[PDB]
């Protein structure tokens, strides 16, 4: 067995010539020499098995990607993992190589307009069809924006993922919440548990306003900290956008801050295009019932050199005990084998 930094990465040998790319979740991602297909491909190797939260999160993204074909969403090429339940320890799921992810660009690389604008449409593009399945994805940032060299995009990691559920949506003040933090709606912080396809536009308009300075637009350093950074640029909601918060703590909390006048974007970002911040202003709005959904955003004057319906495809249909999940596991997975 192929061992890379210390551990097991034992991908058969249909892929050799192992490189380190980073940490994964549950395990490291190498590159490797596909010997069929004849490219390297990446390889993320997940050990989910003890935890409850961990097989359901690997069985999640499993089911998912499989059910999934679009060109702005990472598909799974293969999986490999042992013949039998018994013996089954790890699973590895074998991916398109991508050069890059939008985190590491952005921590090296100034964008062009016209390169913010091509990474906006290909994420929202992707977006597009996830909704269309009513899926939400529910962690997107940077990081999990993969990037080839011709600067072809494509969502990853469904781990979070759930199935739309708008009339679950309502929750109290202060309820806990696991997506990364910088890209958290403000309703998460008030009276929503993210179950509705508003959560995810809020990330991309935080991705669009990192991309147009290289920096987070909200890096709170904790949970009612990242609330502290919103009303900070957004200023404070309006009347009617309070009295659409019915729970008591969450509307109350609000009336007990000083006001705080909006900061224009033109003055945050002097140098974007101004249709740009336009969209950013619609994906960025406080109240989620009147903040822009995913074919809209396609359709604003910013992406009208790449806007086409046609053109962005939607899913075919809508989607829908940790011994009980690793079986299921190996049964999600059961197509990759050999026999
Ligand atoms: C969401 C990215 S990841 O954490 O799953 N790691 C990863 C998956 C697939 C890839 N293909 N090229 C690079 C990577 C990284």
């Not at 033109?266 to 974007?272: G, H, I, K, S, W």
């Amino acid at each position: 067995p192929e061992m890379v930094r210390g551990q097991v990465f034992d991908v058969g040998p249909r892929y050799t010539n192992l490189s380190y790319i980073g940490e994964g979740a549950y395990g490291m991602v190498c590159s490797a020499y596909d010997n069929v297909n004849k490219v390297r491909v990446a390889i993320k190797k997940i050990s989910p098995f003890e935890h409850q939260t961990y097989c359901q999160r690997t069985l999640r993204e499993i089911k998912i990607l499989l059910r999934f074909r679009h060109e702005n969403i990472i598909g799974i090429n293969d999986i490999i993992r042992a013949p039998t339940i018994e013996q089954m320890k790890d699973v590895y799921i074998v991916q398109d190589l991508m050069e890059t992810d939008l985190y590491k660009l952005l921590k090296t690389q100034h964008l062009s307009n016209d390169h913010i604008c091509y990474f906006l449409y290909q994420i929202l593009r992707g977006l597009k069809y996830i909704h269309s399945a009513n899926v939400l994805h529910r962690d997107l940032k940077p990081s999990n924006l993969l990037l080839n060299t011709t600067c072809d995009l494509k969502i990853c990691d469904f781990g979070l993922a759930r199935v739309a559920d708008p009339d679950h949506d309502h929750t109290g003040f202060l309820t806990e919440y696991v997506a990364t933090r910088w890209y958290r709606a403000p309703e998460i912080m008030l009276n929503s548990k993210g179950y509705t396809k508003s959560i995810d536009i809020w990330s991309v308009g935080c991705i669009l306003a990192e991309m147009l300075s290289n920096r987070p637009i909200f890096p709170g350093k904790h949970y009612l900290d990242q609330l502290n950074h919103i009303l900070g640029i957004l200023g404070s909601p309006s009347q009617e956008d309070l009295n659409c918060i019915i729970n008591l703590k969450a509307r109350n909390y609000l009336l007990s801050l000083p006001h705080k006048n909006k900061v224009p974007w033109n003055r945050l970002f002097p140098n974007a295009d101004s249709k740009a911040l336009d969209l950013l202003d619609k994906m960025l709005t406080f109240n989620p019932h009147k903040r822009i959904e995913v074919e809209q955003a396609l359709a604003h004057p910013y992406l009208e050199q790449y806007y086409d319906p046609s053109d962005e495809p939607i899913a075919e249909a809508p989607f829908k005990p940790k011994e009980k999940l690793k079986e299921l596991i190996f049964e999600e997975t059961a197509r990759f084998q050999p026999g």
